Amino acid sequence: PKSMQCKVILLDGSEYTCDVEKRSRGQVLFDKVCEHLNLLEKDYFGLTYRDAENQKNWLDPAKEIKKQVRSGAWHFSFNVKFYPPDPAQLSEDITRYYLCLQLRDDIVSGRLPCSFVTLALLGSYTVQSELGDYDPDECGSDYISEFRFAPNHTKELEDKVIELHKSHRGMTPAEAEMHFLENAKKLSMYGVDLHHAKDSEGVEIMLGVCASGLLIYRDRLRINRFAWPKVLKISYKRNNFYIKIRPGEFEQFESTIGFKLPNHRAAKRLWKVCVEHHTFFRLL
Ligand SMILES: NC(=O)c1cnc(C(F)(F)F)nc1
Numbered sequence: 258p259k260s261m262q263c264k265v266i267l268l269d270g271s272e273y274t275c276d277v278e279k280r281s282r283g284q285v286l287f288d289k290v291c292e293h294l295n296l297l298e299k300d301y302f303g304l305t306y307r308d309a310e311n312q313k314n315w316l317d318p319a320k321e322i323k324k325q326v327r328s329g330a331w332h333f334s335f336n337v338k339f340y341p342p343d344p345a346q347l348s349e350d351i352t353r354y355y356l357c358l359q360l361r362d363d364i365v366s367g368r369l370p371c372s373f374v375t376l377a378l379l380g381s382y383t384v385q386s387e388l389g390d391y392d393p394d395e396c397g398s399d400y401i402s403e404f405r406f407a408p409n410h411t412k413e414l415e416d417k418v419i420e421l422h423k424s425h426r427g428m429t430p431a432e433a434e435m436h437f438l439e440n441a442k443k444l445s446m447y448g449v450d451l452h453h454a455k456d457s458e459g460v461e462i463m464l465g466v467c468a469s470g471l472l473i474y475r476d477r478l479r480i481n482r483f484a485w486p487k488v489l490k491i492s493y494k495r496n497n498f499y500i501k502i503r504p505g506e507f508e509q510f511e512s513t514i515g516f517k518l519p520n521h522r523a524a525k526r527l528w529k530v531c532v533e534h535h536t537f538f539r540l541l
C-alpha cells in the first residue's frame with residue numbers, strides 16, 4: 258500500500274507532515290490534520306492547495322487528493338472555509354482560537370481591511386491572550402511587539418496596542434479571543450471571499466462570497482447584495498458565471514445576471530464556493 262507524504266501549513270505558521278495512501282480522498286488528510294489540532298468543530302475549516310495556475314483551491318474531501326493536486330506537490334494550508342457570523346455560538350474555545358489565528362492572517366495580509374483603532378484593539382486582545390497581563394518590564398517607551406498586527410506597522414500603532422493592553426488586566430485567553438471575535442465579526446469584509454470579474458458590459462467588479470450572500474463591488478457608491486434566499490440557481494459555462502435572482506412579488510419571471518471570469522477554472526471555482534456557502538449557511 259503506497260503512501261504519499263503531505264505537508265500542511267497550520268494557522269500558527271508551523272508545518273505538519275503526515276502520510277496517506279496515494280488514492281486517499283481529501284477527507285482522510287483533513288481528519289488527520291484536525292485530530293492533530295484537537296479540533297472537533299471541523300465543519301468551518303478546510304485545506305487549500307495551489308493549482309497549476311498558482312490559484313488557491315479548496316481540497317474537496319469527497320474526491321481523490323491526486324485528481325485535485327494533479328501535477329503539483331502534496332502541499333496544503335489549513336484554513337477557515339466558512340467564517341461563523343456569530344463566533345460566540347461555537348461550542349469550543351479551541352475552535353474560536355483557530356478562527357482568531359485565521360483572522361490575524363486575514364488582517365496582516367490586507368484581505369480584511371481594518372481602521373487604526375480596530376487594528377490596535379484586535380492587537381491588544383491577541384497580546385492579552387498570548388502574554389497575559391500587561392508587564393511594563395517587557396515594554397519601554399520604544400517597544401515593538403514580535404506580533405504582526407497590520408499590513409503596515411507604525412510606532413503609533415504599537416503604542417495604541419500597549420495602551421489598550423493595559424486595560425485588559427485579568428482577562429483570560431478564551432475571554433480575550435472572544436473579544437477579538439466580537440470585534441472582527443463586525444468588519445465589512447469579515448469572511449468575504451473576493452473574486453475578480455467583469456459585468457455584462459465588461460466593467461471590472463469584485464464578487465464577494467460570504468454567509469449573508471453574494472456581494473457585487475462596482476464602486477464605493479455602488480455595492481449590490483443578493484441574500485442566499487433570493488438566489489434560486491448558480492451556474493457556469495465557459496468563462497461565464499450566471500445567477501438566477503428569484504422573482505420579486507407579483508413579477509412574472511426570474512432575472513439573470515451574467516459575469517465574465519478570467520478563465521473557465523476561475524468560473525468553476527466561484528460556482529463551487531457559492532454552492533458550498535449556499536448549502537452551509539442554508540443549514541447553519
Ligand atoms: N468543512 C469540512 O468539513 C471540510 C472537510 N474536508 C475538507 C477537505 F478534506 F477537503 F479538506 N474540507 C472541508
Ligand SMILES: NC(=O)c1cnc(C(F)(F)F)nc1
Pocket residue numbers: 372374375376378379440441443444445
Ligand atoms: N468596522 C467595524 O465594524 C469595527 C469593528 N470593530 C471595531 C473595534 F475593534 F474598534 F471595536 N471597530 C470597528
